[PDB]
């Protein structure tokens, strides 16, 4: 199986690196506008390869994507000194405008998988301009999130993470909702789960353990700029999903037709992930507070969206 | 890391066989009453290293148990032609009396795992022979069903097996309670997935779901004289829980306090598993018919129990 | 990708766990005369599955043989104490006169891989029968006494196996040829490798190390009767081989034109094993007495196939 | 089990990476003069690790390396576009003339794995100011070419890489020898093989090769400014070499006595490497001609060093 990766950055890079490691595809095209920066990555990462798995690793153009499964849509311009939010985005939706037309003329059969910031904007732009079906165009969105939320609630109870459920809704960012109400661990609401054990829950480690998901990605800025290894080794994961139709459920951002009395917004909601991308959308129980957010959290979004022509 | 198994036959060399090829454990001995039988089976077992893990694996006696973390009990005598399971059952007791002072004599901190059938009963035996605490005897109980149970209801939901928490609880064999009532799918209620999902799940649809888990240990038996492989490989997993010290959740059985108004019986239940054994009890939520069949199931055991002395 | 097994027995059905614990191939289908026998081993295996990887394990027909890419032929009679290598072998062709027509009729594109012993004169049965080119019928043949090989060497030299290269080569049995004076370690010649390690390998050390190899199967029958946990981990090694086109080098049996004056027989030679079955041959140096042992080989089995008229 | 890392730029970072991707250690610890560095990747790898495997990566302080297996060191300064070979040198020995003592305070009885470049000078300073045993000190070396001529062999020849011997020895750099004469294949001499095969090398081939291996630091530094992916993956495989004590052969660089008449150099040379580090060195055959160039090879790092005082 064939897997491409259109801009060869530290983010697609990074995925490129997480996808060989840990073999899940048998190649991985990069493309970049910088032909030797893309060069550059696909070797160093070919040295990798003989101490973990046979992938073969190499870079080059869009038409190189023919028959790619899935590709990773990685690419984004250099933040400018003075430069509004506002008017990066802009510039990025110009760049994916150009990329999305170029990856499907050569793999229309590709799951298309976001992760330039901001995801769920950029989830939006490119589900308007590829014109395939809303499943196809699947963003990131807040996995990480999903799963450091499940990790540290597993931490606190002294339980295997994979037995916690736990959600991280909506936009991928300081507006995320983490869905206490309803999380289970062991097919048990949290907080029994929490009682049953020792350990009630208080409102400041609901406070503690919100700072670690929310915040996460700011700290990890804030020390080195920029975060790539935790969602190279995500989308990976993603990949693999898509490449073995493996209909997991994903916190994943996609257009959704309705969310909280909002229509039409592209968002991270618990979705089933398989071949042709994501067939299916799970609808977890949310409180008043919780939908409440969800709802201003879609609203911030999709004027973003209108705001941008897309 | 060092792994016991006691009773190299079909059972105990099938376990010895899933935990070569899974890498989990570097080091498994095998022991035997008849010393070749164990012999042939771990030099079987080891030509096959090569072609999976590093794994060293060999028989010897109980002495060569020592620094063994989990000692797996899969001894056992066969069948007579004309005897009751009620004196099968004895003859066992009468083994197993004779094997964990042998296996606590030389690995006093090993977690016990009980694989003999009928793994409840068999599962007390060993708890009230041991004099160790609770926790530390752990019987595979219906962790196969469990995962069988929640495999077709990811068929029939087009879904990962991953996302469906269900349990069988109770008693390994024809009484055992699949929980339906309870059983969510990612994070929501069974029922309501179903739904969302055109799949409402008729009376029929749940009887075949019945029979797939209920009867597959017995058409195995008929088929082929004996289950094996199934239960290597769920071993080889509690083993790996153990190892790990994963603390995941897992349907074993193990001698309670109470359940279901039933009190001190050994039975499957969601268990919290870990470097000690079990260290905690998940209390899935029951409908009144869940639960009395639960305790009839509870009911049969303790008596067996009692009825044998231990 | 789809494994076909005909042969469910305990040759068959260890190559199929195997298979599925590594998780080698996403189908595995398996045939035999008794049906709800290999029934009973799908339904045993498939409960394993969810404790390793997802792998469709069933049993069928031989149509159900369609599209399949290895077929692992292990089908074969039932021993009987007394009767001669040369009875059990009449029988056992026999049997694959039956089974050979009825796989290519079904799979014809699929690479044969024999397994039923003796393997390399039932190998040669199966390629004469099948009128397929010589690479695409492969016997598992002495994969294992050349891996078990190079174990007691690494042990000896204090090294990884993966270091040591070294073959046994012929006859999968009694007149098979360690291949002393050519092995290497590390890319070194042995004894000089094994001099410098101050280690010179006395006539001891080779005496119970040919010992450790060649009389490996035959112990393992003494104790339990047969082999089969060692060639259904080393058959799964060869299936992955083939499905993912390695063209690895292994000591594999298969119809050779000439062998040290012997013509036409099927004997195991590292041979480059990939998607089309074996596609060349490696000839390492062999010592004059080396080349006497394995022309004598080649010579056992070619009268033995010329008496059942092959 | 504990890994240390010291520097955690791109080439400690990535290290830690591929030690979470691949599951080769529990915990792995960060440390860098740059705090909030470290804590950025540190937490930017920990949100990955849901995705692979349960490993805990945390940033730290030199104490916090207390109970490391193995410490990697890949602290160094920022290149100086126009700087000397000799100066980036003169500081980066300054820099391992903080950081070693530190180490060896905290976890006197880690392995200390060199990386930071160039790396057989730096392994020849840390363990001059170590003042461990010879081989508790390893450089990565050559490996990554080690590899990289493996595989373009296997390429040529259309065989796996696995199949290859050959060896990359001396300078990680320009001097660096690859060691065509006594190159196996499969056990076999490489050009005879190659002749057998029909291919014999032509002098383009061995050319076009040679550039392969080479010159690939050289593309990618000049296409994206350094390398890490690859040793990153190469210096996991040690690590892992060293925490299972495989004692694998592997291109590293470590102090070696004498080679080729050159005294009291390190550099790298086919070696067994374990939990002790290397203990043990492999010499393939060289050629007059690879003589010479390893004397070359040599000289200029015993240069290098003595001008360094070491
Ligand atoms: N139109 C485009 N097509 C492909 N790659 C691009 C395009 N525009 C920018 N890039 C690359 O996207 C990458 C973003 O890097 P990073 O933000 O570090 O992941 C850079 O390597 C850019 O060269
Ligand atoms: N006291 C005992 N200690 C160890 N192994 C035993 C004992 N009694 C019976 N066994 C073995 O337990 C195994 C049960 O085989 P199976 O029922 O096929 O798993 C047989 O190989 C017996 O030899
Ligand atoms: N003609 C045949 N077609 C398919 N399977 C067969 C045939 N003859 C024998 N077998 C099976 O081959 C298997 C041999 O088992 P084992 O020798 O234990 O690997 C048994 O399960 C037999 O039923
Ligand atoms: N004395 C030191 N102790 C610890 N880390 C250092 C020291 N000097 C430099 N470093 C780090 O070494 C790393 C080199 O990064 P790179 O060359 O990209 O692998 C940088 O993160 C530096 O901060």
Redesign the interface.
């Given at each position: 199986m064939k897997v491409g990766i259109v801009g060869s950055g530290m983010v697609g890079?990074?995925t490129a690196?997480?996808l060989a490691?840990?073999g899940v595809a048998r190649e991985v095209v990069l493309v970049d506008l910088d032909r030797?920066?893309?060069?550059?990555?696909a070797?160093?990462?070919?040295?990798?390869?003989?101490?973990?798995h046979?992938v073969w690793v190499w870079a080059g153009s869009y038409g190189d994507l023919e028959g790619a499964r899935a590709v990773v849509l990685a690419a984004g311009v250099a933040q400018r000194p003075g430069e509004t939010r506002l008017q990066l985005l802009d510039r990025n939706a110009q760049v994916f405008a150009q990329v999305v037309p170029r990856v499907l003329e050569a793999a229309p059969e590709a799951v298309l998988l976001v992760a330039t910031n901001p995801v769920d904007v950029m989830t939006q732009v490119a589900y308007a301009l590829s014109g395939l079906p809303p499943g196809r165009v699947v963003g990131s969105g807040t996995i990480?999130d999903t799963?450091?939320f499940?990790?540290l609630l597993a931490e606190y109870l002294?339980?295997?993470?994979?037995?916690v459920?736990?959600?991280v809704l909506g936009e991928h960012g300081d507006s995320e909702v983490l869905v206490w109400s309803?999380?289970?661990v062991?097919?048990?609401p949290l907080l029994e789960?929490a009682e049953?054990?020792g350990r009630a829950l208080s409102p400041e480690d609901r406070a503690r353990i919100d700072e670690g998901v929310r915040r996460?990605a700011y700290?990890?800025?804030?020390?080195?700029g920029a975060?790539?290894?935790?969602?190279?080794?995500?989308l990976?994961?993603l990949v693999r999903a898509i490449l073995?139709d493996?209909?997991?459920?994903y916190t994943v951002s996609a257009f959704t037709p309705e969310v909280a009395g909002v229509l039409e917004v592209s968002l991270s909601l618990?979705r089933?992930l398989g071949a042709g991308g994501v067939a299916?959308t799970?609808?977890?129980?949310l409180s008043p507070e919780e939908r409440a957010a969800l709802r201003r959290s879609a609203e911030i979004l999709k004027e973003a969206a209108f705001a941008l022509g897309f």
């Open positions: 890079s990074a690196y997480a490691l840990l030797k920066l893309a060069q550059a990555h070797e160093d990462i070919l040295h990798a390869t003989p101490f973990a046979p990480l799963a450091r499940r990790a002294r339980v295997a993470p994979q037995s459920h736990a959600y309803s999380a289970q062991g097919g048990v789960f049953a054990r996460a700290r990890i800025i804030e020390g080195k975060t790539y290894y935790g969602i190279g080794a995500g990976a994961r073995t493996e209909k997991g459920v618990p089933i299916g799970v609808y977890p129980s």
